[PDB]
Amino acid sequence: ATLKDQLIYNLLKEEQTPQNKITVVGVGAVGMACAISILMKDLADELALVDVIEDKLKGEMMDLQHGSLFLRTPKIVSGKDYNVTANSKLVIITAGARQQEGESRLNLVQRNVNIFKFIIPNVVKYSPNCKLLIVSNPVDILTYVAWKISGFPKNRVIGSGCNLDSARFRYLMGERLGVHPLSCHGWVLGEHGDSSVPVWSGMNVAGVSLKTLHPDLGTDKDKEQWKEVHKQVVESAYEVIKLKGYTSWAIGLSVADLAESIMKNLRRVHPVSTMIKGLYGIKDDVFLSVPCILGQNGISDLVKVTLTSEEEARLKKSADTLWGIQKELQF
Amino acid sequence: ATLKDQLIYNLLKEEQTPQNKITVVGVGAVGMACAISILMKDLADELALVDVIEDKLKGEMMDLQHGSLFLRTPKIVSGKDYNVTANSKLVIITAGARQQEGESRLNLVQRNVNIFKFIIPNVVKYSPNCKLLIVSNPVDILTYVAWKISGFPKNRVIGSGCNLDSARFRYLMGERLGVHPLSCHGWVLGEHGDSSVPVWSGMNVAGVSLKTLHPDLGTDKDKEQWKEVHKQVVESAYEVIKLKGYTSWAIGLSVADLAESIMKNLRRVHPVSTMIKGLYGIKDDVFLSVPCILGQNGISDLVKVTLTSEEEARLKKSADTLWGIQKELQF
Amino acid sequence: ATLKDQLIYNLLKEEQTPQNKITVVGVGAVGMACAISILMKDLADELALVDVIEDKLKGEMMDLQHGSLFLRTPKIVSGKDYNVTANSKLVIITAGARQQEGESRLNLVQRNVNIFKFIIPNVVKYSPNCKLLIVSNPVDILTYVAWKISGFPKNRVIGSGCNLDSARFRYLMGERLGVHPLSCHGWVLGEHGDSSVPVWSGMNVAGVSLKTLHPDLGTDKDKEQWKEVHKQVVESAYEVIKLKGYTSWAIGLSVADLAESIMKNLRRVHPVSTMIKGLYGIKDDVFLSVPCILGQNGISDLVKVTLTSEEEARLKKSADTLWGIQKELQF
Amino acid sequence: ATLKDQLIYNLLKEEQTPQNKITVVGVGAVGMACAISILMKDLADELALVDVIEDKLKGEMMDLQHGSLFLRTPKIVSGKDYNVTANSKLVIITAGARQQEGESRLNLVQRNVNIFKFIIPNVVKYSPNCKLLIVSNPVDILTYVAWKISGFPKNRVIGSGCNLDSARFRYLMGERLGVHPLSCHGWVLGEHGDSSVPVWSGMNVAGVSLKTLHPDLGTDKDKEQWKEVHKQVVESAYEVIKLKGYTSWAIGLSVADLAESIMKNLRRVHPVSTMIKGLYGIKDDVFLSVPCILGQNGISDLVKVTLTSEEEARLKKSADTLWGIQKELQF
């Protein structure tokens, strides 16, 4: 005889179970951007957030929940314990250790590895069938780490790899050609960051190859210096971090885009990081970005792009470096 | 023989005026939430951002540009100079000091009134015809301030006001009833702050008045203590602030909602702050929230909510404090 | 080797379980408006169509497919055999005779019950767990029929019922008020047809009772003749049929609206056809519209609207008319 | 006191300038498919419809209006009088005779020109600065006709052209490769009809040339027979017309795609009919489809595709046919 029972006659028993649920692990700037991007595209019927910093955590969930009136994601949960994560179709990992001067390289990744040693088994425990999307840097190596710890088949472990990189290149291409980024095509492949590969030959508007029309494209001997676009892609992140302290909006939109293909089983093609041992002369267990078909089973297929022998070596080189790092890691 | 000329044949050297342009002033946590919300709802063809911190400004502009590939707003610009703002349909003011843990919105007034005296005249010079949407706290007073300085008729100066408070209210109502906030209706009017008014008589689902079903609603002796919903609404800012340091996502979605009504001339009804002199008897030029019809000319109409004498006494009470602050003000 | 195989390396194979499949039975004018609306709101990952007219079926199927580039529904299938229907979460029934000019929906009952004998058993055989969304007229009776035939628990058999009449009501109220229909609240309940009942007491804007403000709302003496608004809702279908031969856009949009709450587990409240025995003096298995919570398990709850003795009498009358037809039925 | 006066306190009158108005001329199958797809993408703040058949026109308008609750387009009007179309940003012409089974679109010319002789002056009179989007067939000749009669600069006279043919092409391409159409690139250029030209050289996935992998692509030689994909494109309209009698959904989606780029000033690239005298060796005022940047001013730029030797001759032949027809046109 409460107000609720006087107002509502109940008919049904107890069968909840979110059908289309996503978890984001890490509520730093990247994680919440992914979160907001996912809420505003209606990708999920349940959103769960996890982090080890409890005050931050809860505060972010509340803020988001207070905007429910303007969303169509009817349940938003969070917490330090991975039970809130239960039965997620997709889990996005952004958590990472904060970097720091006064230490070199293996230190950084090993530290993140120590964190994934606790995060990963927790996620698989609660969502043994989910697809994993890794965003934490260095991304290609952490995707391998997530892949090894989890035990998942390679199709279900995906690193954001060069996805944003390629988005950046398309913005810059579009800005020069006075064309919208959707209509400028170009792929940034390989290792996310400094050693990424701009595949000039695939660069085009409307099917029209820019290399075929402008042979100097991507070389050092070109009056337009297109090579600069790619050097801008590599340096844009540092630039943004220098300017604002971190990047968030763009990687969030970027990750929402992947989530959409997967949640909705689109089979769109996106540059993401995948386990390519057995391709391009690559002989070790390493993750690099190639064009992958993304749907309800994660990466079900990838595109074999034809690469120049120079592009092959760049890839190979990255592979040897990631493997060198990886074989020194403590799991 | 440039690549661009070889690739693209130009028809129109010409270039039009900005048509569906929004400017956000202040790119802090609220400003950027508003920006991203706006961009994900396709509300504008041009987004302009202004701040006094240059590097932060450039950083946020670039991060947003980097996700252009996934958006549908082809022009994103920024600058310290208000020329980048010209011909904006809507200008959103999110700049100024924010609350520390426990601090009253009312303790921000002198320093935000200063800031406004420098911002507004610059906004007006470049967009004499825009609607002004004020978010900065204390929002009801700053809406009065924007109004006096700009010289705009009252229909074009809107305070985000109680649109957030009512959304929080519906969120909690919905959590109690197990119904989506879109289907739970209820209004919080007055000051966006401690002295806001829950109009118990309008709370309902499917048109059935909860007050009528349960006459103790909103009363001390209400065994269900619905009063507490209002008090959690009142307290929501502090709780979230003390948890993550500020609020942003909700006000972001809230602000996008108002923008949507304005840009698309929807004529929907929202609780926002407006000049209510000549209502509820109320005598002075005070701005506070009451439901308003919102559209291409801003606030074209006010809804006359029926209030009990207690409610009206609270509203007027709020009107009294607020005018006392404005009247003493600096400009 | 095949072009496909030189371009694409396959990791998995052809998995094929759709997670959010919708079926539309009947590709007439209503079926196809429901389809395109659903397609444009991204409610499904697979859409399947069926009809007995095979050439028409294929054409519609193909015309939607040719628009895939512009959609986010990656599989569209059709067939006269219900196997194309397998594993649907939501099956929408729009097949059957429709009203000629001036014709009562009730006059359609025997023809439509005759095709339901076949359609319902076939749909349940391939989607035993689906929710059933009935649209064919007379919609309340056919919801009862589908319920009796299928054996489904009543939470999973839903009539589109008065979502459309309420929407038309709010359109007309908004027109009189200069307010977007979204901010007008008004419920049309009971038979989707001539015996419908407008609930005067729940009509409001911003939570303010129009009836309390204007105590003659809904009455014969009312100078404003608001009762004319409901007459218009009652006549609306007839006027549209007389003008264009049938109706389709509004229903397509109403059905997509119900589908959305169901597929995204929103728990929004709509006026839909459901079993009302036990309420308002009704002692038989009558199906008509009452406000219900719609979510992933169909109707989970009913809002118990409070009615004036006049309002209730009218509703009980609508229930008698309906029962009077149901009882004679033989299927 | 009337309800409205009692409820709402008015601030001002004014009201006028529609901000983003679109008009559809012709409410047949095609026009309403355009109307609905535009309504569901929130591209306009006002939509006007016209037709010569008065009852049908009013009926469709009412049907759309009855769906207002589910839309964000606050005003829909219609009339046989073109004053209802005043100040449209975009006017879409779908009126006219359509193909019977097996009929060439070129056979409709004399019938549709006579219609355009009355229509174009009426549209331009009320909306002198609108962009005109032509859909009636034969769409390339009628775009030329609209251009001659209206006196508009060529940027503002656009034929929906091959946007649809290319969408068909990418749909079939994607079916063959197991990849979403969004991710399959390929262009169909020239006449929207039997003489269209598939540009094999620009066909690709992730920038990887299908023609380079598979040199016999598109010729009579290839065991894969890719040419049949283009034949299905040319034939698609007839097959569908035979099945269902006309086509409607894909064109409506195609047109809504174009409208989006025009209304939101996206500068995306589409194959649409435009004036190409001066290109590929063509010397008369022929309009046909090439990739064009579309934005707030219509077509601002064309993309110069590199066409193989065989492709240039086809286009020419295509231009010759059309011109031959044109030369004989009287107006």
Ligand SMILES: NC(=O)C1=CN([C@@H]2O[C@H](COP(=O)(O)OP(=O)(O)OC[C@H]3O[C@@H](n4cnc5c(N)ncnc54)[C@H](O)[C@@H]3O)[C@@H](O)[C@H]2O)C=CC1
């Ligand atoms: N792949 C790409 O293109 C991009 C990758 N990133 C990477 O994304 C990651 C996130 O960056 P930000 O959000 O700015 O960093 P952040 O430091 O603000 O976020 C990390 C969050 O994860 C939490 N965390 C740490 N260990 C955890 C664990 N044991 N379990 C759960 N939560 C844990 C932290 O408390 C923190 O809230 C960084 O590694 C960054 O390098 C950032 C931008 C782009």
Ligand SMILES: NC(=O)C1=CN([C@@H]2O[C@H](COP(=O)(O)OP(=O)(O)OC[C@H]3O[C@@H](n4cnc5c(N)ncnc54)[C@H](O)[C@@H]3O)[C@@H](O)[C@H]2O)C=CC1
């Ligand atoms: N109305 C409402 O419901 C709510 C209001 N707020 C208010 O929003 C305001 C900002 O909040 P946050 O964004 O978190 O603060 P913030 O510190 O993150 O950002 C404020 C921004 O304003 C900028 N700014 C200061 N003076 C300026 C001027 N002269 N011209 C241009 N930009 C200037 C600052 O540089 C800063 O980037 C505060 O007043 C806060 O109280 C916050 C939440 C809700």
Ligand SMILES: NC(=O)C1=CN([C@@H]2O[C@H](COP(=O)(O)OP(=O)(O)OC[C@H]3O[C@@H](n4cnc5c(N)ncnc54)[C@H](O)[C@@H]3O)[C@@H](O)[C@H]2O)C=CC1
């Ligand atoms: N509930 C509501 O608010 C509304 C309901 N309707 C009702 O929807 C129904 C359909 O209307 P329209 O689409 O305009 O009719 P329509 O005449 O345009 O199409 C009816 C379709 O049903 C198919 N059909 C007939 N028997 C079938 C069976 N055995 N199995 C599969 N398909 C079969 C026909 O082949 C045809 O394609 C009518 O009953 C009409 O009264 C119409 C508007 C609103």
Ligand SMILES: NC(=O)C1=CN([C@@H]2O[C@H](COP(=O)(O)OP(=O)(O)OC[C@H]3O[C@@H](n4cnc5c(N)ncnc54)[C@H](O)[C@@H]3O)[C@@H](O)[C@H]2O)C=CC1
């Ligand atoms: N370009 C493309 O990809 C496509 C073009 N079409 C063309 O679209 C056109 C429309 O076809 P439907 O909509 O299926 O035909 P429809 O027969 O369904 O409707 C044609 C409408 O135009 C109206 N109309 C006729 N004469 C008129 C005049 N003098 N002034 C104003 N309105 C007039 C009619 O009353 C009728 O309502 C046809 O020319 C068709 O070939 C159709 C599909 C695709």
